[PDB]
């Protein structure tokens, strides 16, 4: 029942910096602590084992040490190929558990979002259903908030977001919204609206359009 | 030398179960503990159990015991995996490790839904209005309905790549749904035509769908 507290879940970094991942164990687990690196392809490797032993093929720039209760992973001069996810572990006590993990991303500059909303289209009101889509287009950092309004009014029900990956040309994110509503429900209602707000946002960015106009 | 090899993915039923495999080689089997491990789309790694295949003693995480079955075939140095009474919160990808997570696996995908093979629909995503003149327009598809994985997505015919993403799939009420963004200059669109390619190979399906403004229009779709 041994927890491990890993930190940050997200680490923005920058190529050739040295960086440190942190994971705490609730009790004392001596050397017992094992490191994993995770690809993008979802295979996994074990970098480091006992604490400070460097596995086969592990690059030095590799290291890992412990002090008191607080292990850490070290690396170096971070590569390209290392903003990936990582894990600590323990097999000092069964069963054995594992950190939370931490995804390295690369720092940039901020950039703000932009919004687009796209009312149904007429062929999926034919067929009983309603999706209204939002886009929130190339924007750092990945944290953001979105929401849907009917009428004036929040909804939080029947939302479905999705978020790209780090984009390997210029380091932004992306999200999309999708409000999926009954056909009936969305007759009901005139206008709808994505409020999409971020660190760059002076104030928030609304989007809307309302469905008795054209 | 030491490697371990899983079986393929899988897409099974509520309520069925699946049997999953993990070959282990260059290392004598009996030796060594066999661990299973568990991990949510987009979450962290969860610990299953392990295996000593010498006497095929088993020690389970009491979050999945019942829920998963390790045994091993000490003459095929294979260890198994067997899921039951599946649903939603099984689908996962799945790792085979051998102690003390030395070693790993590929990981198999394990897929838990009702539906059968469904194309997608593929639905238009033009503005609502706000024509902006001299700079970029975001138009998009909507991919949706559709199972099992995976779909295609390109923006004329690989024509328009400038300002594309496709956002990754959510398998939401048995079924999968994924939208594409395409950015292009406001002097080529409405003025030349914007299509988006959508394949679909389980139901063998290929479909076109151009993008046209809004308006109130009805009947858009039996053209474009
Ligand atoms: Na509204």
């Known amino acids: 029942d041994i927890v491990l507290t890993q930190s940050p879940s997200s680490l923005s970094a920058s190529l050739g910096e040295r960086v440190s991942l942190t994971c705490r164990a609730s009790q004392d687990i001596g050397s017992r602590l094992n490191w994993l690196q995770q690809k993008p392809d979802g295979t996994i490797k074990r970098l480091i084992h006992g604490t400070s032993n460097l596995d086969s093929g592990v690059p030095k720039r590799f290291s890992g040490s412990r002090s008191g209760s607080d292990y850490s992973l070290t690396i170096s001069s971070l590569e390209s190929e290392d903003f990936v996810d990582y894990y600590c572990l323990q097999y000092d006590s069964s069963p054995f558990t594992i950190g939370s993990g931490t995804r390295l991303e690369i720092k940039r500059a901020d950039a703000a979002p932009t919004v687009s909303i796209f009312p149904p289209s007429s062929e999926q009101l034919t067929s009983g259903g309603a999706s209204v889509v939002c886009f929130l287009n190339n924007f750092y950092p990945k944290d953001i908030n979105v929401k849907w309004k009917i009428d004036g009014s929040e909804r939080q029900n029947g939302v479905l977001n999705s978020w790209t990956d780090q984009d390997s040309k210029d380091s932004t994110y992306s999200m999309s919204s999708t409000l999926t509503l009954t056909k009936d429900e969305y007759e009901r209602h005139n206008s709808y609206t994505c409020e999409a707000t971020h660190k760059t946002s002076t104030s928030p960015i609304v989007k809307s359009f309302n469905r008795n106009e054209c | 030398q030491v490697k371990l090899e899983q079986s393929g993915p899988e897409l099974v039923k509520p309520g069925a179960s699946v049997r999953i495999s993990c070959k282990a080689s260059?290392?004598?089997?009996?030796?060594?503990?066999m661990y299973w491990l568990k991990q949510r789309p987009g979450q962290g790694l969860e610990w299953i159990g392990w295996?000593?295949?010498?006497?095929?003693?088993?020690e389970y995480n009491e979050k999945f015991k019942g829920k998963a079955t390790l045994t091993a075939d000490k003459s095929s140095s294979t260890t198994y995996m067997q899921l039951s009474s599946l649903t939603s919160e099984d689908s996962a990808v799945y790792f085979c490790?051998?102690?003390?997570?030395?070693?790993w696996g590929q990981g198999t995908l394990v897929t838990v839904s009702a539906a059968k093979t469904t194309p997608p629909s593929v639905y238009p995503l033009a503005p609502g209005s706000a024509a902006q003149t001299n700079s970029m327009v975001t138009l998009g598809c909507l991919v949706k309905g559709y199972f099992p994985e995976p779909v295609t997505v390109t923006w004329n015919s690989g024509s328009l790549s400038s300002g594309v993403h496709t956002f990754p799939a959510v398998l939401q009420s048995d079924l999968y749904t994924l939208s594409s963004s395409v950015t292009v200059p406001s002097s080529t669109w409405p003025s030349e035509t914007v299509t988006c390619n959508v394949a679909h190979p389980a139901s063998s399906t290929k479909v076109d769908k151009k993008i046209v403004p809004r308006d109130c229009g009805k009947h858009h779709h039996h053209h474009h």
């Open positions: 260059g290392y004598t089997f009996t030796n060594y503990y």
């Open positions: 490790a051998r102690s003390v997570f030395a070693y």
């Open positions: 295996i000593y295949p010498g006497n095929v003693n088993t």
